Design a protein around this ligand. Structure first.
Ligand SMILES: O=c1ccc2ccccc2o1
Ligand SMILES: [Ca+2]
Ligand SMILES: [Ca+2]
Length: 279
């Protein structure tokens, strides 16, 4: 399948070079997989989700995304026009308030929730969780991410936007999960992207067009935007049978575009998520 005039990030993950505009992907498109977006919620009624999104848990007064961030990330995972895995099932877990803030205790509860909830859902090709959030180091937050991964869910987390070593941020610094840095359309590390030995992979993160609340769209930047590209790619690969939840991060790193990025500090991987699609 080919989507012409795709958002640049989708084109990038299906090409060995920057500058293309077509997203090539297998028609299976993540069907049969499930991705939990743990964030400010998801506007499930957005036409771009085609009825494939639903809220399953909120830690606040409402399950509505009053912010937009969670809807944007979900859109990159799995919306028709802006998503990597266009037929996946999306579940929203609202652990961030409408200002995009949340306490560590709530974020941990949200991870433990998904570890249990996945047992109640029909996801034959596997389960992914996308966490476009983080804050200062916390061993308890890392431990929660490690448990989620251990339970059999492919966990992808944002490296953070401090232009710093991600070792000082959580859950980015938990080695067992897949920590995602951001790049721009010229294959440069995004100027805000954290880096360091704990990063596993890079994805498109600068100027990413996706869904927004009020049935709209908008372009924003962050490691928060790169993370759903990797989460969607994982869902897409599990559906194809190429990898499992336990090994998807390693498989993505193994099959990545290598050495294409500039401004990567010594000690940080130079690997860009790539779907290896061949028609
Ligand atoms: O869009 C965002 C806003 C804040 C933030 C903080 C830590 C990690 C990722 C983040 O993404
Ligand atoms: Ca290349
Ligand atoms: Ca890792």
């Amino acid at each position: 399948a080919a989507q012409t005039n795709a958002p640049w990030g989708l084109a990038r993950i299906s090409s060995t070079s920057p500058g293309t505009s077509t997203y090539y992907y297998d028609e299976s498109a993540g069907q049969g997989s499930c991705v939990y977006v743990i964030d400010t919620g998801i506007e499930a009624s957005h036409p771009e989700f085609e009825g494939r999104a639903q809220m399953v848990k909120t830690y606040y007064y409402s399950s509505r995304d009053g912010n937009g961030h969670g809807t944007h990330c979900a859109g990159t995972v799995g919306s028709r026009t802006y998503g990597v895995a266009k037929k996946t099932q999306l579940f929203g877990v609202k652990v961030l308030d409408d200002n995009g803030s949340g306490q560590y205790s709530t974020i941990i509860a949200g991870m433990d929730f998904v570890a249990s909830d996945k047992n109640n859902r029909n996801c034959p090709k596997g389960v992914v969780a996308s966490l476009s959030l983080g804050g200062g180091y916390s061993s308890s937050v890392n431990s929660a991410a490690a448990r989620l991964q251990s339970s059999g869910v492919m966990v992808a987390v944002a490296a953070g936007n401090n232009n710093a070593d991600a070792r000082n941020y959580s859950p980015a610094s938990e080695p067992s999960v897949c920590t995602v840095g951001a790049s721009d359309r010229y294959d440069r590390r995004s100027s805000f992207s954290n880096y360091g030995s704990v990063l596993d992979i890079f994805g498109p993160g600068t100027d990413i067009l996706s869904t927004w609340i009020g049935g709209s769209t908008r372009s924003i930047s962050g490691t928060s935007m790169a993370t759903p590209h990797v989460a969607g790619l994982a869902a897409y690969l599990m559906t194809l049978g190429k990898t499992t939840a336990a090994s998807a991060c390693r498989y993505i790193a193994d099959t990545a575009n290598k050495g294409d990025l500039s401004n990567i500090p010594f000690g940080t991987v130079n690997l860009l998520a790539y779907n290896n699609y061949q028609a």
